[PDB]
């Protein structure tokens, strides 16, 4: 099944900057997120369809995660990617899609919509703790990008 | 002369957690700020009076900022440091101090109480543009430390 969850967020950063920075995620992520060590393109040019291998550490152990870039829609400052392999897909999970869409906020910032689509195998539902973890990672990635823009204002 | 300015910024991060990040600047600053590559203690043991060097590489050229730790008060979630030399000190400034102390805020978050203390040479008043930069830097770094914490939720 597919189970969809939407959360509304804010940023003091304007949306075109966050959008441009979201596209440098491969460079930003290992800098800001301690446990992300590398991001390598397996296939593709960085746009939709691109497969990426992420090397992370969990408890001193190296683990590998696979991401796919799904779609980008610059018109709506929208960037979608999915987790397609590794530890975040327990046996009853097929894939998890993380969508981000941004609009201008009331004071030079942004209003964001973070959508999590949790794809299960057959009849299964998302485990509640797995959904919690997934939402945390998706928002954490958004906050890594935002934090990088806040710390490096001349770059966007 | 000395000229001082207060502001308050809210954070969703609870103060003990946010404070732990404030005290870990030597590790965090090179992670968040692209051009800051390392922090070296020049004199002292890390507490008040410690002099630190932030090593920067900007467009290929090595530079530094010098910091002095002014006060650390864990009980009241306070971490104060000064820029005392190098590229972050304008030629018209003697010293610029960035004070941060946290109090409990709404929803188990924090309010960061920021003070900028701008020390001029002799009888001059602060350069208005440098005051602007100093205020923006103080807020921007608070928001970026916060962002690092929100991007790394396990580390806390
Ligand atoms: O967990 S995942 O579902 O792949 C995941 C989901 C959504 C966004 C992610 C961004 C970076 C790294 C991931 N993996 C990761 C794993 C461990 C530590 C830090 C990051 C992300
Ligand atoms: O370029 S600055 O003028 O400082 C600057 C000005 C205004 C806002 C800033 C926000 C984050 C980082 C900066 N720079 C920074 C540079 C080195 C160390 C720490 C902060 C900001
Ligand atoms: Na790193
Ligand atoms: Na890292
Ligand atoms: Na750096």
UniProtKB/TrEMBL annotation, chains A, B:
Domain Bet v I/Major latex protein: 1-152
Superkingdom field: Eukaryota
Keywords from the named record: Pathogenesis-related protein, Plant defense
InterPro entries the UniProt entry points to: Bet_v_I/MLP, Bet_v_I_allergen, Plant_def-hormone_signal, START-like_dom_sf
Pfam families, per the entry: Bet_v_1
GO biological process: abscisic acid-activated signaling pathway; defense response
A GO-annotated cellular component: cytoplasm
GO MF entries: abscisic acid binding; protein phosphatase inhibitor activity; signaling receptor activity
Family indicated by similarity: Belongs to the BetVI family.
Protein name: Ara h 8 allergen
Record organism: Arachis hypogaea (Peanut)
